[PDB]
């Protein structure tokens, strides 16, 4: 009953406009990392968390919301801005979110407020 973290992508983010995102920590069974998740289809951060923590359980992973905020993806100008907070989880450490994002989008100019 071994869960593989190398299979869960660190960043899974939409690609066009402004959307709420969350920084979540997945926990493997006795092993741990943080992941970026943000979608345009969610009115609230809890919605993203529900959906994602749900998928994680199917991979044998435990979830914890370490905060949230917003991502401004400007696919055109190759820019991704990370800022704000989530009212249900508080602010996320956007520095970590941008670390993983910039790693996935090197050609992009990533920043956080």
The whole-angstrom separation of Cα 93 and Cα 74 is 21
- 32 assigned binding-site residue: no
88 labelled ligand-binding: yes
Experimental method: X-ray
Alpha carbon 85 to its chain centroid, in Å, reads 13
Q: Domains (ranges, CATH) in the chain?
A: 4-113 (3.50.20.20)
Do 75 and 89 touch, CB atoms closer than 8 A?
A: no
Question: Which active-site residues does the annotation give?
Answer: 45
62-74 sheet: strands from edge to edge: 11-13, 32-39, 18-27, 62-74, 79-83, 109-112
86 is in an annotated binding site: yes
> Cα 87–92–108 angle (5° rounding)?
120
Resolution to 1 decimal, in Å? 2.7
Kindly state the tokens that stand for 2.
Answer: 């071994």
- Helix/strand/coil (H/E/C) assignment for every residue in the chain: CCCCHHHCCCEEECCCCEEEEEEEEEECCCCEEEEEEEECCCCCHHHHHHHHHHHHHCCCCEEEEEEEEEEEEECCCCEEEEECCECCCEECCHHHHHHHHHHHCCCCEEEEC
């Amino acid at each position: 009953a071994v869960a593989d973290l190398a299979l869960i992508p660190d960043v899974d983010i939409d690609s066009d406009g402004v959307f709420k995102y969350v920084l979540i920590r997945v926990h493997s069974a006795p092993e741990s990392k943080e992941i970026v998740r943000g979608y345009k289809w969610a009115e609230y951060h809890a919605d993203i968390y529900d959906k994602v923590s749900g998928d994680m359980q199917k991979q044998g992973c435990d979830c914890e919301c370490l905060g949230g905020g917003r991502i401004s993806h400007q696919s055109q100008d190759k820019k991704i801005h990370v800022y704000g907070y989530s009212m249900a989880y508080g602010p996320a450490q956007h520095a970590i979110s941008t670390e993983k994002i910039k790693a996935k989008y090197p050609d992009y100019e990533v920043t956080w407020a």
